[PDB]
Amino acid sequence: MVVQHNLTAMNANRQLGITTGAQAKSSEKLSSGYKINRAADDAAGLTISEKMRS
Amino acid sequence: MVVQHNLTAMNANRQLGITTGAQAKSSEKLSSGYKINRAADDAAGLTISEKMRS
């Protein structure tokens, strides 16, 4: 083992970051009840929806 | 189910409107006693009924 860098943990950490990212993306859709809150969800769908809302 | 738009209720609402349109257009004829109350009912029979009243 290397004492100086816990590379077993830094990957568990990076994967935890990807998972807590996907969780805050999901939680927002449930609290707002919109699948598309920003263009980064679905740019054609944000655009198409504003045409249809209008 | 989407929480953010109850489309079965918007349908039942939009059909309830069409139904109580038909109900109020029937009710007017029963209370007044005339089939043609206004020229939207049929304009040939409004026109002919004024020539026959005349």
How does this structure look, described?
This is part of a larger assembly, with two copies of chain A (54 residues). Chain A is mostly helical and 54 residues long. In chain A, 69% of the residues lie in helices and 0% in strands. Chain A has two helices and no strands. The first copy, chain A, has helices at 7-32, 43-53. Chain A starts with 6 loop residues before the first helix and ends with a helix. The A-B interface holds A 32-34 and B 2-4.
Q: Could you list some keywords that capture this structure?
A:
part of a larger assembly, 2 chains, 54 residues, mainly alpha, 0% strand, elongated, structural protein, Flagellin, Helical, Filament
From the alpha-carbon coordinates, what is the Rg of chain A to the nearest angstrom? 18 Å
Give the helix/strand class of chain A.
Answer: mainly alpha
Distance between the termini of chain A: 62 Å
Major sheet details of chain A: none
Family (chains A, B): Belongs to the bacterial flagellin family.
Organism (chains A, B): Roseburia hominis (strain DSM 16839 / JCM 17582 / NCIMB 14029 / A2-183)
Function (chains A, B): Flagellin is the subunit protein which polymerizes to form the filaments of bacterial flagella.
Subcellular location (chains A, B): Secreted; Bacterial flagellum
